[PDB]
Amino acid sequence: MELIRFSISIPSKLLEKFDQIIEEIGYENRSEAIRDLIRDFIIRHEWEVGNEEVAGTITIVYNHDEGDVVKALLDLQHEYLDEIISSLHVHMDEHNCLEVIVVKGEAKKIKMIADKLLSLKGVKHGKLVMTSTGKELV
């Protein structure tokens, strides 16, 4: 383990706004929030360049009674058995379901999976969260 200490210069008003927000959010200090910003930045780069394994989640909301969205979702998901780990489903109301799919594999592959799922007519709301397996982060 090795910690490297270095200095940086940030516009004073920008920094003031930052400190105000991170406190409200719940961060204990500025260094923790900035390290998080850097981890986030590195993860985004991981999804842009390379073939390294990444992980993500795809959250969707739909009316299971409308059209063939239910059958369409299953067929798409079963087409990617290697990338999709599992999914959590919550019955919102009589007709609406919330589903979150956990995926792990190559970035391009996962982005295509999200494109297919989210572009479904029956999917009303949806979002892909790009994160990490944590292996390459500390």
Binding-site residue ranges: 78, 89, 91, 97
CB 33 within 8 A of CB 27: yes
Stretch that binds Cl ion, among 4-12, 92-100, 120-128, 129-137 (CB under 5 A): 4-12
Per CB under 8 A, does 37 bind its own copies?
yes
Rank residues 6 and 51 by Cβ distance to its own copies and give the closer one: 6
Nearest residue to Ni ion, scored by beta-carbon proximity: 97
* Structure-token pair, residue 53: 């394994």
- 111 backbone dihedrals φ, ψ, rounded to 5°: -65, -35
For 44, 48, 50, 58, 119, the CA distances from 116, given in Å and listed in that order, are 21, 19, 22, 11, 5
Where in 70-129 is the site for its own copies (CB under 8 A)? Answer: 70-71, 74, 77-78, 81, 84-98, 100, 102, 104, 115-116, 118-121, 123-127, 129
Of 37 and 129, which CB lies nearer to Cl ion in the complex structure?
A: 37
What's the min distance (Å) between Cβ of 22 and Ni ion? 26
Specify whether the backbone of 27 is left (phi greater than 0), alpha (psi in -120 to 50) or beta: beta
H or E segment to which residue 106 belongs: strand 96-106
Which residues does the annotation place in the binding site for Ni(2+)?
78, 89, 91, 97
